[PDB]
Amino acid sequence: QLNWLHFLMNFGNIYANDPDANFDSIRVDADNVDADLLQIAGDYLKAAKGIHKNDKAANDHLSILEAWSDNDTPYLHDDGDNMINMDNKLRLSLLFSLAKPLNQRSGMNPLITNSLVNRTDDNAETAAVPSYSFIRAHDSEVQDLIRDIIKAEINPNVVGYSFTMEEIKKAFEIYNKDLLATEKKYTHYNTALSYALLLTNKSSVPRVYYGDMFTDDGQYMAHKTINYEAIETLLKARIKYVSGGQAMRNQQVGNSEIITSVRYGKGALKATDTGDRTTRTSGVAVIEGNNPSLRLKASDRVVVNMGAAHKNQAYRPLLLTTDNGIKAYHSDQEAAGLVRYTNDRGELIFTAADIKGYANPQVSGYLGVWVPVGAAADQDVRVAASTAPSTDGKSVHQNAALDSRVMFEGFSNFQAFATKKEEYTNVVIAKNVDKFAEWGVTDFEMAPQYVDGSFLDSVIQNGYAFTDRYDLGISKPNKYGTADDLVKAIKALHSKGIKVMADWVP
Ligand SMILES: [Mg+2]
């Protein structure tokens, strides 16, 4: 229903008499999506928000399709890029090359080529097709893993997803211990390696999942994951360093392989571009392996071309793999003891002294990330959207301005129920908006707000009549707080210029 969409996009106007309390954008939350409905949703955004006119209008109302497939990408593209779809091939490359157990783990080449964008050499001012990229989401796998854990370790007779509260309790004890284990029976390997690629890739809007920075269970933002520090470090570095063209390479070395991923720096689309002073102190190198047994030969070298702005230059680590986890460096001074140089050609050179396989709770393989020395404390290589008219018939354009955005899926289906007002998700969001701004979050994907411990979207969406979808914590609190708490959260995100995405189930 399009009149329910109209209500959601005017919730601030209708409930609060306050346009600053309106949602900015739409998550089209499908089973199957009819192409006709995608066209009508696009028509709403063009008529109401003028997204066809220029990138500033489009990027202030950036809307997505969630249909668990790539299938609608051609139709969305042909209909004028009025919303962006997921890059499902890249998600599957991250899952199989990095996250899977060793006996199912793919070679690393798909991380480069098995995507909407072949990132071997991505030098485009504007990518052909816009997208968002992610590794996990609220319904990507946890419900399945909790079922697997209960079936294997607690109750082998369980039918479907019909669990007792005590079964889910016990299953999360096992799940949470597995997150902290080197040898993982259930949970994903190499989360930080997946985020290092997601947050340095060109030509996609990355979406960070709440449950990769905080525990999937327990109170909102109460318990940081072991990967919180690595992911926060990458998010802050993305603002400061991540710009320009991309090169990805895949080298056989010793008994295994590595990939390299380079961004040339702001104002350098090609490896030959020299750019300006800001190009010199931006860009990044990511080095990854997915094999804990990786050992380089004494003669093995990994030569990493940083681009023509980076000849004869000091580099320092951002993230390095250690025996026990990942060390983060928060300044040039903190990394002073590990400075290395590019040569006359702008190449970093790594050896067995730098790269080997590790097995720890965060890494199954290898991660190293390097940034140029000398960035100002306030350096920000993001760019604002153009107000010049769009001239190709498309609304959303995957250019440097869209690449500057970060989406945050700001909920877990398995969050604990608040025991006091201070624990309500929407109260906590309002209190912590400075943190989302620090991370470069531009688009905040909120939980469904209408009026329950269900963790299956199927059960939730079946459990509420069409009138229930107008009750956004109004008749009684939703799981996330009162309607007034929702209004305050939307206004708080707007106070930092962060856009807020409504969950629209057609
Ligand atoms: Mg969905």
* CA-based torsion, 87, 92, 97, 99: positive or negative: positive
| C-alpha span between 413 and 294 (Å, rounded) | 37
Q: How far is the CA of 503 from the centre of ligand 1 (A)?
A: 9
The DSSP string of 158-192 is --TT---HHHHHHHHHHHHHHHT-SS-SSSPS-HH
Radius of gyration of the chain (CA): 23
Residue keyed to tokens 């190449």: 347
Q: 125, 243 in Cβ contact below 8 A?
A: no
Q: What is the DSSP letter of 371?
A: E
**Strands, sheet with 443-445, edge to edge from the N-terminal-most edge strand:** 64-66, 25-29, 499-504, 443-445, 407-409, 205-209, 131-133, 85-86
| C-alpha span between 38 and 76 (Å, rounded) | 7
Segments making up each domain of the chain, as ranges: 142-187
Q: Of the candidates 169, 97, 158, 87, which has an alpha carbon nearest to the alpha carbon of residue 128?
A: 87
CB count in 10 Å sphere of residue 157: 6
Q: 90, 423 in Cβ contact below 8 A?
A: no
| C-alpha span between 7 and 175 (Å, rounded) | 39
SS3 label, residue 500: strand
Structure tokens at 19: 């346009």
One-letter amino acid at 359 equals A
SS3 label, residue 504: strand
Looking from the CA of 183 toward its CB, the CA atoms found within 13 Å total: 1
Mutual orientation of helices 2-9 and 35-49 as an angle, nearest 10°? 30
Q: How far is the CA of 191 from the centre of ligand 1 (A)?
A: 22
Expressed in percent and rounded to 5, the helix, strand and coil fractions of the chain are 35, 20, 50
Q: 51, 88 in Cβ contact below 8 A?
A: no
CB count in 10 Å sphere of residue 292: 18
In angstroms, what CA-CA distances link 433 with 108, 406, 411, 491, 496? 36, 14, 15, 10, 7
Q: How far is the CA of 451 from the centre of ligand 1 (A)?
A: 17
Q: How far is the CA of 30 from the centre of ligand 1 (A)?
A: 6
SS3 label, residue 59: helix
Q: How far is the CA of 31 from the centre of ligand 1 (A)?
A: 8
Length of the chain: 506
Q: How far is the CA of 66 from the centre of ligand 1 (A)?
A: 6
Mutual orientation of helices 228-241 and 191-198 as an angle, nearest 10°? 10
| C-alpha span between 250 and 368 (Å, rounded) | 15
Structure tokens at 340: 């290395």
What phi, psi does 144 have (nearest 5°)?
Answer: -65, -45
Q: How far is the CA of 230 from the centre of ligand 1 (A)?
A: 28
Structure tokens at 366: 């290898």
Structure tokens at 94: 């991250």
SS3 label, residue 422: helix
CB count in 10 Å sphere of residue 158: 15
| C-alpha span between 348 and 329 (Å, rounded) | 19
Q: How far is the CA of 136 from the centre of ligand 1 (A)?
A: 13
* CA-based torsion, 383, 384, 390, 392: positive or negative: positive
| C-alpha span between 474 and 259 (Å, rounded) | 51
Q: How far is the CA of 70 from the centre of ligand 1 (A)?
A: 14
* 287 beta partners: 260, 368
Give every CB contact of residue 270 below 8 A, 6+ residues apart in sequence. Answer: 123, 245, 264
Residue keyed to tokens 């104002």: 267
Give every CB contact of residue 281 below 8 A, 6+ residues apart in sequence. Answer: 265, 372, 373, 374, 375, 376, 379
Q: How far is the CA of 325 from the centre of ligand 1 (A)?
A: 33
Q: How far is the CA of 138 from the centre of ligand 1 (A)?
A: 9
Structure tokens at 79: 């209909």
Q: How far is the CA of 448 from the centre of ligand 1 (A)?
A: 10
Q: How far is the CA of 11 from the centre of ligand 1 (A)?
A: 21
| C-alpha span between 116 and 4 (Å, rounded) | 32
Q: How far is the CA of 56 from the centre of ligand 1 (A)?
A: 28
Give every CB contact of residue 486 below 8 A, 6+ residues apart in sequence. Answer: 426, 449, 472, 473, 478, 480
Q: How far is the CA of 457 from the centre of ligand 1 (A)?
A: 7
Classify each residue of 162-196 as buried b or exposed e, where b means 16 or more C-beta atoms within 10 Å of its C-beta.
Answer: ebeeebbebbbebbbebbeeeebebbbbbbbbbbb
Q: How far is the CA of 456 from the centre of ligand 1 (A)?
A: 10
Looking from the CA of 333 toward its CB, the CA atoms found within 13 Å total: 2
Looking from the CA of 370 toward its CB, the CA atoms found within 13 Å total: 28
- For the chain, the residues before each gap (C–N > 2.5 Å) are 30, 451
Pairing type for strands 25-29 and 364-372 reads: unpaired
Q: How far is the CA of 413 from the centre of ligand 1 (A)?
A: 12
CA 145 and chain centroid, separation? 21
Residue keyed to tokens 């211990």: 177
Q: Of the candidates 370, 374, 398, which has an alpha carbon nearest to the alpha carbon of residue 279?
A: 374
One-letter amino acid at 322 equals T
CA 450 and chain centroid, separation? 25
Structure tokens at 303: 């030569």
Q: How far is the CA of 68 from the centre of ligand 1 (A)?
A: 8
| C-alpha span between 234 and 242 (Å, rounded) | 10
301 burial (CB, 10 Å; 0-12 / 13-18 / 19+) is: middle
* 66 beta partners: 29
| C-alpha span between 167 and 143 (Å, rounded) | 13
Q: How far is the CA of 504 from the centre of ligand 1 (A)?
A: 10
Q: How far is the CA of 34 from the centre of ligand 1 (A)?
A: 15
One-letter amino acid at 403 equals D
What phi, psi does 402 have (nearest 5°)?
Answer: -70, -40
In angstroms, what CA-CA distances link 202 with 74, 124, 130, 244, 365? 20, 9, 11, 8, 23
SS3 label, residue 436: helix
In angstroms, what CA-CA distances link 344 with 244, 246, 282, 415? 21, 20, 18, 53
Q: How far is the CA of 137 from the centre of ligand 1 (A)?
A: 10
Q: How far is the CA of 322 from the centre of ligand 1 (A)?
A: 37
Structure tokens at 466: 């069409």
Q: How far is the CA of 67 from the centre of ligand 1 (A)?
A: 6
| C-alpha span between 180 and 93 (Å, rounded) | 24
CA 57 and chain centroid, separation? 23
Q: Of the candidates 170, 183, 104, 243, which has an alpha carbon nearest to the alpha carbon of residue 363?
A: 183
| C-alpha span between 11 and 300 (Å, rounded) | 60
The DSSP string of 385-419 is PP-SPP-SS-S---SHHHHT--EEE---TTPPPPS
Q: How far is the CA of 314 from the centre of ligand 1 (A)?
A: 46
PDB resolution in Å? 1.5
Pairing type for strands 407-409 and 326-328 reads: unpaired
Residue keyed to tokens 């380079």: 262
| C-alpha span between 302 and 284 (Å, rounded) | 16
Question: Longest Cα pair distance anywhere in the chain, in angstroms?
Answer: 70
Q: How far is the CA of 72 from the centre of ligand 1 (A)?
A: 15
Residue keyed to tokens 């889910």: 168
Q: How far is the CA of 455 from the centre of ligand 1 (A)?
A: 12
Q: 204, 131 in Cβ contact below 8 A?
A: yes
Q: How far is the CA of 76 from the centre of ligand 1 (A)?
A: 18
Q: How far is the CA of 132 from the centre of ligand 1 (A)?
A: 15
Q: What is the DSSP letter of 214?
A: B
Q: How far is the CA of 176 from the centre of ligand 1 (A)?
A: 25
Structure tokens at 408: 């945050």
One-letter amino acid at 136 equals R
Q: 199, 238 in Cβ contact below 8 A?
A: yes
